């Protein structure tokens with residue numbers, strides 16, 4: 001599922017801005 | 021047509037009143053922008069209680085004002101680290117913007133000061149925590165719930181853009197929920213006063229507009245793209261473009277393809293296709309009709325914009341609140357004392373703070 005793909009991305013936590 | 025005479029006259033008058041409000045708000049902003057405040061408190065006026073958040077910038081602590089007993093959120097920046105990170109202009113800009121703006125969904129700077137080692141910005145304490153945490157916990161927000169938050173962002177960007185401020189940092193991580201369930205926007209380091217175009221690569225991968233990724237000159241329409249990402253993520257529980265690595269996210273963003281959960285309403289999909297529009301000549305918020313294309317869209321037909329501004333709408337969600345100083349809606353962090361050097365650091369660079 002799309003939700004499963006989201007979990008698989010590893011980007012479910014707080015996301016940093018580019019400069020970091 | 022779509023509106024009878026009474027409805028059309030009401031909408032026309034409402035849009036004219038917005039213009040009148042914004043003209044006065046710009047006058048008030050420019051007065052404060054030209055004459056900022058400074059040195060309105062000192063460190064031993066506050067007891068430090070708990071760290072609420074950390075970043076490369078420094079940290080934000082819950083503090084209690086001794087004289088009044090009021091709680092506040094105190095942002096502490098290490099001057100030497102700000103310099104090493106090339107963030108002098110951003111830090112001075114954040115403070116200058118915060119002291120000059122005034123809007124019910126923008127956090128209020130109550131005090132600022134500096135000492136030998138650090139810079140301090142003391143803001144009202146917003147006890148409900150980040151939207152991010154509530155969204156991941158609940159999973160997704162209903163369309164009425166997402167719409168209540170979205171309306172506040174639309175009005176906030178309408179205000180900021182009238183002042184020629186581009187925000188550039190929208191995401192659930194950067195939105196707090198207050199005691200009445202309304203939104204507070206806090207971070208202005210990446211905001212810029214630009215009437216025309218600007219060119220800096222900045223933001224968060226999932227929320228970047230295509231024209232930023234493609235290294236173009238861009239304008240305030242990047243904020244309306246980001247609103248589209250935010251509405252999508254609030255209503256789905258995940259953003260429209262994601263992948264293992266940022267370069268793969270960017271390929272998706274620029275492709276012009278977006279897919280929706282089957283539970284999205286047709287009205288929501290129509291709005292999102294017009295906000296997540298790669299073609300700038302077609303993106304809502306960037307057309308002749310301006311913000312009105314968004315505010316008058318069918319998905320917002322039940323929104324009473326004045327009632328949202330006046331905070332008279334009952335919020336769909338009230339965070340848990342046990343009393344002043346309750347920190348249960350924030351994370352736990354390792355505490356670290358704040359040392360003040362006997363020697364002033366970086367005085368020249370921060371002379372305007």
Ligand SMILES: C[C@@H]1CNCCN1S(=O)(=O)c1cccc2cnccc12
Pocket residue numbers: 072073074080093095127143144145146147150193194195196206207
């Ligand atoms: C995520 C937000 C924004 N990014 C920086 C870190 N913070 S914060 O530490 O929560 C924070 C910042 C500003 C004012 C605040 C007022 N009340 C509570 C917390 C506050």
